[PDB]
Nucleic acid binder design. Sequence first.
RNA 1: UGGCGCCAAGCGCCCGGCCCCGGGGCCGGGCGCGACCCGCUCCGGGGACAGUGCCAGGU
RNA 2: GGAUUGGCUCUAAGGGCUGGCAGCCGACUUAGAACUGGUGCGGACCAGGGGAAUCCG
RNA 3: UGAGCUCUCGCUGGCCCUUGAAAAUCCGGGGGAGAGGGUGUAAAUCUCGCGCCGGGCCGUACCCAUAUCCGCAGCAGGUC
RNA 4: CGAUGGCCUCCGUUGCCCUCAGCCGAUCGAAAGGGAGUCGGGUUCAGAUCCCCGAAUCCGGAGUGGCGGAGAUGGGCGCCGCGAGGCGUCCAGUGCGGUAACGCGACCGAUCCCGGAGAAGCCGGCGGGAGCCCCGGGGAGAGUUCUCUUUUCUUUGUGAA
Lengths: 69, 114, 135
Amino acid sequence: PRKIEEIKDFLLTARRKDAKSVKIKKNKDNVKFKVRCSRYLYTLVITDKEKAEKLKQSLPPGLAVKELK
Amino acid sequence: VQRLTYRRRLSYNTASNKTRLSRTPGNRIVYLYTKKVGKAPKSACGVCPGRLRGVRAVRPKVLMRLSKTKKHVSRAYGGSMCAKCVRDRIKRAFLIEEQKIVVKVLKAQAQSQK
Amino acid sequence: GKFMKPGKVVLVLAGRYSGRKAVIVKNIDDGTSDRPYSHALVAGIDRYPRKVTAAMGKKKIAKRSKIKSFVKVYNYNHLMPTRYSVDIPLDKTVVNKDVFRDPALKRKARREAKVKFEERYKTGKNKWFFQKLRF
RNA sequence: UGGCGCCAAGCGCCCGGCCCCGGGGCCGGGCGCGACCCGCUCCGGGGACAGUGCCAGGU
RNA sequence: GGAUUGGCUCUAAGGGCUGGCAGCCGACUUAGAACUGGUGCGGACCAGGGGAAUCCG
RNA sequence: UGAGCUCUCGCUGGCCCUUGAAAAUCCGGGGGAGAGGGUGUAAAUCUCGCGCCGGGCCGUACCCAUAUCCGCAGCAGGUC
RNA sequence: CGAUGGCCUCCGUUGCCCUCAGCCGAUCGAAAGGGAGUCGGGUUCAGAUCCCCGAAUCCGGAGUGGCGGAGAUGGGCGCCGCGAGGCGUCCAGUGCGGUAACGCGACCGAUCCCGGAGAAGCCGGCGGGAGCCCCGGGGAGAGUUCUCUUUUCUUUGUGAA
Ligand SMILES: [Mg+2]
Ligand SMILES: [Mg+2]
Ligand SMILES: [Mg+2]
Ligand SMILES: [Mg+2]
Ligand SMILES: [Mg+2]
Ligand SMILES: [Mg+2]
Ligand SMILES: [Mg+2]
Ligand SMILES: [Zn+2]
């Protein structure tokens, strides 16, 4: 697993051809975006909430999204 | 207290059957088999008893997958000889060269006098 | 008296540049504030010219006889002085202790040192200074 | 003095290809000194004795 | 070759951290004393009999 | 919180008329034979990051001991 | 030198010549010696580091290498342009920093040579880190409650990389 700490490189890895699916985990005080690539699983952690759901529509349309309920 | 067993078929406490305790997410104590401890390379001087700095101390076949900088230090003879012995070698080479030069010039002077 | 003058040839004794031959361009026998130890700014050659010979074309001669130089300030304990000296002129304004505050004009200083080293080496004088030390 | 040392320098004599103006330039090869010559055992040490084969006597 | 050994209630000594002192924490020890039991206290378990000599190695 | 027990890492010392393995495999260095390009769409070359494909054959159950082993046996023995 | 295939480019495949050079001896010999690299959760009547789920990792391979990044893009002169920036000639460019221990994401290189790791006894003392045990509390569930007991017991976590 690899943690992504700045905002934009997460989208950069998300738009790679290798990426399979992104799953959204919504626990208290954190929001985790997990993108599954061939080699690693990249996790981006957002502390607040508003960045999270204004990014939720910024993922590429062709990439599968799964909300963990 | 949970007494625990081996996980391989080797039931003897040899040098390769070395384990350590670990707590799994399942809240249990299990054996994890440990790799043998590596050694940093020894200096090519043959006198300094310590081991070289700046080089990872891992088993020899793990060197195949390390990067070049992790296996050596950027200096002449770096990664195989210690800095103190490098300095001594440098001084020795220069001084023997100077000694040879002065000996040859003295021989030339003696021949000229002869 | 003092022998380590601003024209001396010095065998560098430590660091990445070990075993190289340099020329002192400005010595300071009394440590300054940022450097209490006595030191000196020197210009050396990192890549000695290759062993050139006859029976090869001058394009190959020029390709082989090319120097890579470095400019650095060294502690006196890391410098071994010799009895040799080279009268090669180095421009004080370009090559000075102020060269280390940026990486722009350090390239200029190395450029000037390399050019001067090449034009002196081509003459054949001070040939000892241009052969690597075998150690 | 707890250093380095190989895979020729140099010199001499030939040759090829390309270009420029028989000459010059450019590129690329060969041979020989450097590293002397001639010889019939690789060097030493023993040697017609050690040793071996077959007989004879002693133990 | 001698003496003691239980239980209970105490006393004294042996330290750390923070700001000759003050405060806050603390781990097992050792010694001494009183009281007390139908003289019993290494109460089960664990746990060397001893001495004087001779022969041999 | 602990001279508590076990494992492990490390430092240091003692003993030897005892000095207490080899090879496979891997790595660093010294050298500098070679290669690249003529100022760019730069080239040769990269032990850096990511990406693509594959990893064949054999063993794998259970007992491991006052009843699955050897003692003629469901043997008070023996067995790392 | 000779021939072939692929846009006969550049390389591959050979066949011949020149050149280069040791073996410690074929081979066998360890399911406890050396030996790269997998862990957690779930699942069966009987199998799990092997099945499923999820996270990894080692080795090997690839005409066109699939791609980024490094090698890398600077200086001088004559200029244009107010400048910014843009032209025409030369010159460099197989990385850089720290006094040093050394550091940085890579940072050309063959035959040859040197070295290291593999690769080391027994015992003693001490220290560090884990697992276990122990003490004071918060929870959750149980046991005793003739009298007492803020009580007694169980449980209270995180893999590899
Ligand atoms: Mg084994
Ligand atoms: Mg008697
Ligand atoms: Mg006896
Ligand atoms: Mg089994
Ligand atoms: Mg074998
Ligand atoms: Mg084996
Ligand atoms: Mg853990
Ligand atoms: Zn040394």
